[PDB]
Amino acid sequence: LKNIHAEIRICQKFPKSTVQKRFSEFEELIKAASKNARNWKPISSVELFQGDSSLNELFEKLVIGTCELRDGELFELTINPSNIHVYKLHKDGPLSQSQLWQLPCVEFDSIWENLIYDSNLKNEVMSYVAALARLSEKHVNTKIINVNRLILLTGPPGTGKTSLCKGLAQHLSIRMNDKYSKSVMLEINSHSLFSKWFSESGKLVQKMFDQIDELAEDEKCMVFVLIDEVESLGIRAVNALLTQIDRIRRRDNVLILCTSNLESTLDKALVDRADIVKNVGQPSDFARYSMLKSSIMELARIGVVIDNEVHTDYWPQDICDTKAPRNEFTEILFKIAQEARGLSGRAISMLPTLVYSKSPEETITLPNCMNLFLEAVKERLS
Amino acid sequence: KNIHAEIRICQKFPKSTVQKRFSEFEELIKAASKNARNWKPISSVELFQGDSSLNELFEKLVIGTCELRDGELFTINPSNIHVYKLHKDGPLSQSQLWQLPCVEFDSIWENLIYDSNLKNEVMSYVAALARLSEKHVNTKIINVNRLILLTGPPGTGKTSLCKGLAQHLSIRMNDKYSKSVMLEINSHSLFSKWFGKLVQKMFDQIDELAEDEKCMVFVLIDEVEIRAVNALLTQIDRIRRRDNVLILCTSNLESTLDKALVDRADIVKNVGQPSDFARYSMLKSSIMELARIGVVIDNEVHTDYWPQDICDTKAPRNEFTEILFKIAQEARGLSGRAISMLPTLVYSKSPEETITLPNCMNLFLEAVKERLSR
Ligand SMILES: Nc1ncnc2c1ncn2[C@@H]1O[C@H](COP(=O)(O)OP(=O)(O)O)[C@@H](O)[C@H]1O
């Protein structure tokens, strides 16, 4: 496939100066890792029969991803060394000032891979926003070609729009790391803390955006602006906000992301200002299963769910495309997903800890796990 | 299927010698299990038979299981059986910091009485959050906020439940956590009135304590009900991210202030109907308020014989407290809101504008029966 990217996280103790010098060894790693890899699914180690274990001394985690393939697809390759980016995440943490995030940070790193959708939504947003960023970096005339530098995600509260914005900025900061030396993200109104004072109205919306502006005045640095619960905000201040929004988007090295927890009453002013408006719905039956399966598999990783009676093949597998014979356990779990139609994405993430409390035993058997999960679902719906 | 055991040991005896006699403890707990109450303490004195040497070591033992009801009267793991040693004097103010398990919190869990099996549900759920956290479950796959909000009227002993919960967790997670510490903020509603800069400071000290991975950190914020609030919520997040911490919150409002915290909470549990002991607390609080005002004045009866706090459910009770508890039983149906409005009706019945303690009891009792009817 023509354009595929690779993100590689090195150690802090690994000197960045030597990276370009040992760049050849990284490319060998990527060739070996691609022999068995899933799209956008991170590999943390090169195991036996997959290549020299000395390749493990190079990286902490690598991701190989493309927008040409489905979100989970396995590869079957030609990767230009310009699309492979090496990075180290900052652990500095969020700062009070409206929270400032240093990108890429430790907190955002595992978001993207764990976001589950059935509509190829992740690929669509990723590729489109990358195009907006790529164009903007190349200083496109806004008059000739219309680039708003704003993106809007809408849907119910449980769909994880914020997580999309976090993870999206995480990837873009790495993707564009050759173009930008430093990358920051400013998050506003998380959650609805800003809105009440904003409803009361104040002058400091200007003051807040003026600081973003200074950070935007800094070139070779891209800034991300996330705005949560937009309609909780949007009244003298909403004009200042929109005016301040307009000032910010004019910069080439800036990108603003909005999320609206309300559906079907979108503010006309924001839709008009958006490059793209994406609706994120509550997960479908296939997506619900995927989340439930991921929860169980994670519960098994930490040793919460252990069962030696049933083997890996018999364990619930990926149910994608109905291309494999659905195991009864795979089927029973799917039946649970059918019972969990009302539950949101966040609610499904909440389910495991409720299941854990119900279980008497310190460790849950797989057959009982299915039974407990079903009970929690029913209890959560009531 | 799931049973734990906790054992308090005298400050004298070392921790190794107890480990040597550990096997004897297992055989002892099984024997003590035969005749026992769930989640109720068994004293060393209770059984003189067996070893005086083994009984010299421990002060009391508590056997608890979440599958059984609270007081029911009816299978051992060395890990499931824990061994704790009380911190004699750990309350220091700055907000307060507690070293767990402490002596003060040690007897409160057994004195909490709910009609709704509330203790077991909360115990089980918070334990699940504690275990999941300790195993470092990925947040992005399985969402664990490690923040818990408990809501109910001022008489239902919410903050005590949090204290007793953190006490038992430090003992249950004894093997995983070497040290356990709890910070209690805003008890009660004191920090907002104070004018801050201190909230950033005290939370920074928690961060320092929470830096130790072996340490277990509890943060209890009670009476939760613009710049100071944001700063408080931000600090909550930085702690919330840590794997070794747990945030316990109590609110007097059932549902008025939801947006900020409810979303952050793993679970929001309501206490439910007030128990007999809860309604007693609300009735006593009203009478003392009427006394402070000057509505209820009695110079014949001394302060010792006035209604007192029932800290121990089986301790001796004064004649007046025994009466007020009876009246609290009389009002089984009334909600917390109804009981808090009774004093107005009580004062209405009194012709004297000034009320003695015996007449205060009679008028409260009448007011209770009239509001039940109507
Ligand atoms: N599609 C999904 N896949 C995996 N987890 C999800 C999904 N949707 C929601 N979640 C979980 O629910 C939470 C919702 O996060 P957030 O982005 O704040 O939701 P929203 O932006 O819709 O309010 C996330 O932390 C995530 O763990």
Numbering used by the authors:
A (entry chain B): 8 to 83, 88 to 108, 122 to 258, 274 to 421
B (entry chain C): 9 to 82, 89 to 108, 122 to 222, 226 to 255, 274 to 422
Original paper wording:
Here, we show that Pch2/TRIP13 comprises a new family of AAA+ ATPase protein remodelers, with a substrate-recognition domain similar to the NSF/p97/PEX1 remodeler family and a physical mechanism closely related to the bacterial ClpX unfoldase. Pch2/TRIP13 proteins are members of the functionally diverse AAA+ ATPase family. These proteins share a common architecture, with a family-specific N-terminal domain (NTD) responsible for localization or substrate recognition, and one or two AAA+ ATPase modules that typically assemble into a hexameric ring. We show that TRIP13 converts closed, active MAD2 to its inactive open conformer, and that p31(comet) functions as an adapter to recognize closed MAD2 and deliver it to TRIP13. Thus, TRIP13 regulates the SAC through MAD2 conformational conversion and safety belt disengagement, and a similar mechanism for HORMAD complex disassembly likely underlies the enzyme's regulatory functions in meiosis.
While the PCH-2 NTD (residues 1–99 of 424) lacks detectable sequence homology to other proteins, the structure of this domain shows a clear relationship to the N-terminal substrate recognition domains of a AAA+ ‘classic remodeler’ sub-family that includes NSF, p97, and PEX1. In PCH-2, the NTD contains a single folded domain similar to the NSF/p97/PEX1 N-C subdomain, and as such does not share these proteins' substrate-binding hydrophobic cleft. As in other AAA+ ATPases, the PCH-2 hexamer assembles through interactions between each subunit's large AAA domain and the small AAA domain of a neighboring subunit, with the ATP-binding sites situated near the subunit interfaces. Although no nucleotides were added during purification or crystallization of PCH-2, we observed that two subunits in the hexamer (chains B and E) are bound to ADP, enabling a close analysis of PCH-2 active site structure. Pch2/TRIP13 proteins, in contrast, possesses only a single arginine finger (R312 in C. elegans PCH-2), and our PCH-2 structure shows that a conserved arginine (R385) is properly positioned to act as a Sensor-2 motif. Within the hexamer, four PCH-2 subunits adopt a ‘closed’ conformation equivalent to that observed in most AAA+ ‘classic remodeler’ structures, with the large and small AAA domains tightly associated around the ATP-binding site. Asymmetry in the PCH-2 hexamer arises from large conformational differences in the remaining two subunits (chains C and F, also bound to SO4−), situated on opposite ends of the extended hexamer. Instead, the PCH-2 structure closely resembles several prior structures of the ClpX unfoldase, which contain four ‘closed’ and two ‘open’ subunits arranged in the same pattern as in PCH-2.
